[PDB]
Specification:
This is part of a larger assembly, with one copy of chain A and three copies of chain B. Chain A is α+β, with helices and mostly antiparallel strands. Chain A is built from seven helices and eleven strands. In chain A, the strands form five sheets. Chain A has a three-stranded mixed beta sheet. A two-stranded antiparallel sheet of chain A has the order 1-2. In chain A, α4 packs parallel to α5 (158-175). By secondary structure, chain B is an alpha+beta fold. Chain B is 24% helix and 19% strand. Chain B has eight helices and 14 strands. In chain B, the strands form four sheets. A six-stranded antiparallel beta sheet of chain B has the order 1-4-3-2-5-6, with no helix packed on it. Chain B has a three-stranded mixed beta sheet with strand order 7-8-9. In chain B, strands 11-10-14 form a three-stranded mixed beta sheet, covered by helices on one side. The chains are: A alpha+beta, B alpha+beta. Chains C and D meet through α1 of C and loops of D. Chain A: This is Virion-associated protein. Chain A: Disulfide bonds join 33-66, 125-264, 212-277.
Chain lengths: 285, 393, 49, 393
């Protein structure tokens, strides 16, 4: 009896470790004003450096950039050069090390989601002209013509595609740890895509052919990504009105990219099963 | 490779050279002049930069990360610190058949207190006996104990206030994990990829509270493998024994139905349990078949040898997988190993009082043939001597 | 010759890989994983440059 | 345990009570203080004290004592380990009389080298033939041999290179006694021994040259009177096996008759021989019954298993005591213990050319019942490999 939550191994129970206290101060802490004034300490001491080191005031201009406050009695020395180099250091840290450390982890990447998708070699199912016919008679993004269906590459807005790729990358990195193929682990894997797999049958369906399972939405909002170093990821809508994006009329009214990616994943996972059946239903937000 | 933190003195040499060449036209950096302080300051900036770089890049290694930098980066992948777990066991209550049963029952076992871990039937069964899988209220190893008789905390009308822990084994308790036992079981997890093999089911079913051995089906079983309009196996059945808990190590159907509903999920076939999507199954028990082993010709051996052969036979028969013939050759060997090939030792298998038992036949060679859902349980091993010899003279 | 093995060798490879009967997890392959390794017969082709 | 090992909790309570009554003047102890930790250490130290005393008792027990201590203990009771032995025999050399001889004579028999034991005479005697007592150069069981002709290594003028093994055998060669065999031989002297004279006579008859094994009367050799009760032998009789000289180790009657004369005397029972006064008896031999053994299904296994199974079955049949049945179950157990319990493997015992032999009867079950004064003899082990392997072809 302990609640139980989900994991790449099933439905494990969880807990909390004790606050140790160590933990180096991370990127959030590094601040211009806080170390521009700290860099004044690297200077020597004496009657030449004492009063300039004492009167070193620091202020913030419009665009951050913690500068020195040249009141109308200033005494140009090297101390203000030290303020300069300290603020530089803070800026170059926040512009060079904060990315390239935010981008090395698939659970925090923001601006390099495309490179991550290329690393995992994610190929889409609905975008190739030679898709399997069991993928539906007409996919949500394919319009119809005499020569059968025809697919239309979609150009999502930048923010929506950013959030969608981030979710897909989280799910792919979770799947990379080799889950067991039950329903709890699969749902945990495809959870960042905001969708869940639910069977349609209730009576034990061993004999029953066509083990159908439908996809249901968990929310209509991808958890976004915060490029900053302290805040909350800005959530984005996870759907598209077809008429707004001026797409061919034969497509569905609302198009969900996460639903299609999750469909690809779950059809790939349960392919060896000889009687599977995913049924897709149009979900209006 | 070939790109790392420069030597300190090397770094300042490079910065001094760059300042002298690009700014001062090549002039040397005279110590204690303003250019000396400017060069020193810069260095300082560059070394603080490299130090911060080595600090955070370390805070992202699961081997050397903090501890709360390890609880995340592992709760995002689905690996959590395991808490103190509750012990579990089995009880047995009796009363008037048909009495009313509550849900908030509690059992008092010595100093501990237990509660039903499964659903409680609406009324006591008609037979009057009810077995329940209870679990402790407080976690920890103290939930593990050995007490057999406990009392009922809430007096229920028409039910005896004295319950007996089934076997006196309440097993399953443990303590929590530290920031060092969670490192392992984390990255040692990363180097793993579960596969859903027969070993996986056989090791997963052994988790259930107080299961001692899990065996596959027996050679006396047909064992259908295709539960549907399918082309190759999707069914899997086994056999669990509770050796030191239930008599002869066999549990009633009321217990194993719970394991079946947990492992393969109920509804069964959609992977709602730990088992993979689309794999129906069942965890079945068996029924005892009492057998009486007659070891003829042991008394003329050293008492130590007779004791050894008895303790080996009693253990070989107890551990016999269900639905497997107890043959005479397998018993003769237990004697031929310690007594040697110069000693006389015949064995016989008989039914108690030569009575008939369901699912027990005897072959032409004297072996006991057992049908599925039946397991040879030892009644009594007896030593006898009828063939005269010169051992004692 | 050509690397083509007789049928017995590949039958043994299938028996080692999938089990007997196949799909029961009595082999390297996972439970409920059936299949078969095959071989081919040669066709002699001559090439002239 | 052997001392007492009291209940831990009680011991810690006593330690704490002593520390409080003495040092703190009767007051209890603050948990997690200096005195608490002092008490815990003492306890650990007393636990180690108990352990050390227990093992100091153990180090003076014949059964669990280091070899060195074991040898030192047994030297106080008259049991000493057996040293290594050199082979021995007689060599008959010939040549022209009057030739010179030296102490550097060395003979090459087969692959072994032998040297004079006694002092070589100065000159070859006038008869032209010299018979010399000769021992091997290397100690152990390798010096033992069954040869008839040999060559001289160091050539001597006037002495033909061909020498003869006078007797045709080289007995005695044995290796050093291990520590476990010495332990089990010492422990057989302190323990209470019924029928002590029987084991004494056997251990004495084992010292005759080339006597490999000594066995008691087998089971197929008991006796019953008219009334139907076992008769106890009033004499002392047993069998012996010269396993490296004769076929199957069975010796002709004259040899064992001489052994009897040496062991009991002539007439027996007067103490003229080795045995005590009033100890009659008889050393016996056996007649061989030739048996073929056929192993079917052994081509399915890896070559190592086949080779080791054939070696083990040959070894078992060759070491089978006289007057004991060669049952199919024993060979089948030998094969099972190597090949596994789910391997197909069938053994068959036949007579060569299906001829009738005296003292051999094939019971229905398939065994080879062997009467008294007879012994099984491995004619040939044949394996029937009908091309069956793991993968067709």
């Amino acid at each position: 009896m302990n609640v139980l939550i989900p994991g790449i191994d099933g439905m494990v129970s969880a807990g909390t470790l004790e606050y140790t206290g160590c933990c180096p101060p991370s990127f959030a802490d590094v601040d211009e004003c806080t170390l521009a004034t700290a860099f004044v300490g690297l200077l020597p001491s004496g009657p030449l450096w004492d009063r300039p080191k004492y009167e070193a005031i620091t202020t913030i201009t419009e665009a951050g950039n913690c500068a020195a406050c040249w009141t109308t009695d200033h005494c140009p020395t090297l101390v203000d050069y030290a303020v300069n180099v300290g603020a530089r250091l803070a800026s170059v840290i926040e512009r060079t090390i904060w990315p390239a450390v935010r981008e090395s982890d698939p659970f925090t990447a923001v601006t390099s989601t495309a490179d991550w998708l290329n690393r995992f070699d994610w190929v889409n199912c609905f975008e190739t002209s030679c898709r399997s016919k069991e993928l539906g008679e007409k996919t949500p993004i394919e319009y119809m013509t005499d020569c059968g269906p025809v697919y239309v590459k979609i150009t999502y807005p930048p923010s929506l595609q950013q959030a969608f790729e981030s979710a897909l990358i989280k799910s792919l990195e979770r799947l990379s740890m080799g889950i067991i193929k039950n329903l709890a682990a699969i749902n945990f894997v495809i959870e960042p895509l905001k969708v869940r797999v639910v069977p349609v049958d209730t009576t034990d369906a061993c004999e029953n052919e066509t083990l159908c399972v439908v996809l249901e939405k968990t929310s209509d909002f991808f958890d976004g990504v915060n490029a900053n170093t302290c805040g909350i990821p800005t959530p984005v809508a996870a759907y598209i009105d077809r008429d707004v994006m001026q797409l061919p009329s034969d497509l569905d009214k609302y198009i969900w990219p996460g639903h299609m990616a999750a469909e690809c994943i779950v059809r790939s996972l349960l392919s060896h099963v000889s009687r599977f059946c995913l049924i897709r239903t149009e979900q209006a937000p | 490779c070939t790109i790392q933190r420069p030597d300190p003195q090397d770094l300042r040499n490079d910065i001094a050279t760059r300042f002298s060449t690009n700014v001062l036209g090549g002039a040397p950096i005279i110590p204690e002049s303003n250019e000396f302080y400017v060069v020193s300051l810069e260095y300082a900036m560059q070394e603080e930069f490299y130090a911060f770089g080595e600090q955070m890049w370390r805070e992202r290694d699961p081997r050397f990360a903090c501890c709360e930098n390890l609880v995340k980066m592992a709760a995002e992948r689905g690996v959590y610190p395991k808490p103190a777990q509750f012990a579990q066991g089995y009880v047995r209550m009796t009363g008037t058949p048909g009495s009313a049963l509550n849900q908030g029952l509690r059992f008092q076992f010595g100093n501990q207190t237990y509660e039903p871990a499964s659903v409680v039937p609406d009324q006591l069964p008609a037979t009057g006996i009810l077995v329940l899988r209870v679990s402790a209220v407080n976690p920890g190893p103290s939930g593990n104990a050995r007490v057999t008789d406990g009392t009922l905390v809430t007096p229920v009308p028409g039910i005896s206030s004295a319950v007996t822990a089934y076997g006196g084994n309440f097993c399953g308790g443990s303590d929590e994990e530290e920031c060092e036992q969670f490192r392992t079981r984390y990255l040692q997890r990363l180097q793993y990829q579960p596969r859903f093999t027969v070993e996986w089911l056989k090791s997963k079913a052994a988790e259930w509270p107080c299961v001692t051995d899990v065996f596959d089906l027996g050679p006396n079983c047909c064992a259908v493998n295709a539960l549907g309009e399918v082309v190759c196996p999707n069914n899997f059945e086994f056999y669990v024994l509770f050796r030191d808990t239930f008599d002869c190590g066999l549990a009633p159907q009321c217990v194993v139905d719970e394991i079946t509903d947990w492992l393969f999920g109920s509804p069964q076939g959609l992977g709602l349990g730990e088992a993979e999507f689309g794999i129906c199954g069942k965890v079945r028990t068996a029924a005892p078949v009492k057998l009486d082993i007659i070891l003829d010709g042991l008394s003329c051996a050293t008492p130590a040898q007779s004791r050894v052969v008895e303790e080996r036979v009693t253990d070989f028969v107890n551990r016999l997988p269900p639905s497997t013939n107890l043959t005479i050759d397998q018993l003769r060997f237990i004697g031929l190993q310690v007594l040697g090939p110069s000693f006389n030792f015949n064995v016989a298998i008989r039914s108690p009082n030569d009575a008939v038992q369901p699912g027990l036949r005897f072959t032409s060679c004297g072996d006991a043939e057992i049908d599925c859902d039946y397991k040879a349980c030892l009644n009594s091993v007896v030593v006898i001597n009828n063939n005269v010899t010169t051992s004692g003279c």
